[PDB]
Amino acid sequence: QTWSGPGTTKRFPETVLARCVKYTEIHPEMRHVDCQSVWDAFKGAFISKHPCDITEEDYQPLMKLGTQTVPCNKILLWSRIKDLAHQFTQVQRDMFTLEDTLLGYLADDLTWCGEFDTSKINYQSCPDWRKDCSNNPVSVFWKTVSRRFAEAACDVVHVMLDGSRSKIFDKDSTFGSVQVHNLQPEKVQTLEAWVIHGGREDSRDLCQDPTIKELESIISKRNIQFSCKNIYRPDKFLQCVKNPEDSSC
Ligand SMILES: NC(=O)c1ccc[n+]([C@@H]2O[C@H](COP(=O)([O-])OP(=O)(O)OC[C@H]3O[C@@H](n4cnc5c(N)ncnc54)[C@H](O)[C@@H]3O)[C@@H](O)[C@H]2O)c1
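# nicotinamide-adenine-dinucleotide complex -> structure
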């Protein structure tokens, strides 16, 4: 092991390519996209580069090719609750997480890195953001696209949070550290948090949690309004999303 983190996901190239093909077949706005070109831009960002010396500039060709206009008022951010967030947008096709854009979809759940001294993809190990270095191919990609997604948002921006974390709002998460600080005060009217409950019996009003007050305070300073909703039963939440024209929802 050079690095502490998992190596590049097996079949990474085929996977990105196949994801690109699938995405561009499904999403008509991205029909102009040449997936081979996308892949080549993606590779170019990290191949032959030291995996602790990646910059946002490295991903600019990919950002260019992956240019996508998402409805700015229909953005769902999330933190620590990836699965519910995606289940939600799979059904509420009106709304978009980052992983519902081409670039986020290409990269979701994947790891990748290269090596400085060669042009090969490193399937053995990749830098861990913590135990190794922060400017790695994965962390730099996610910070860049997460920032740009946040910059794109307008009107009411929603964020799904895991109410079972004990830092429900975590300043150190990508949401907390990058996206909160890149919501444009000129465009964003309200950030509304949906705090997802995840455990036994009748729960507190988690919108009163100190970390939520922290989030509210941060965003208020940025001249953006804050709203918060408890989602007490995520299972019933999704069921209501799947069939909304139904009493009890
Ligand atoms: N799809 C993703 O894996 C991804 C990663 C980072 C950020 N984001 C965007 O930011 C928000 C969620 O990120 P979050 O950190 O608040 O929630 P989170 O802590 O749950 O992170 C989501 C995933 O990204 C990984 N991750 C988080 N920060 C990372 C970093 N700096 N370097 C490498 N991997 C990292 C985590 O291990 C986890 O698998 C969402 O709005 C999302 O669209 C998505």
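# post-check
The chain has nine helices and six strands.
The chain has two domains: 1-69+97-152, 70-96+153-249.
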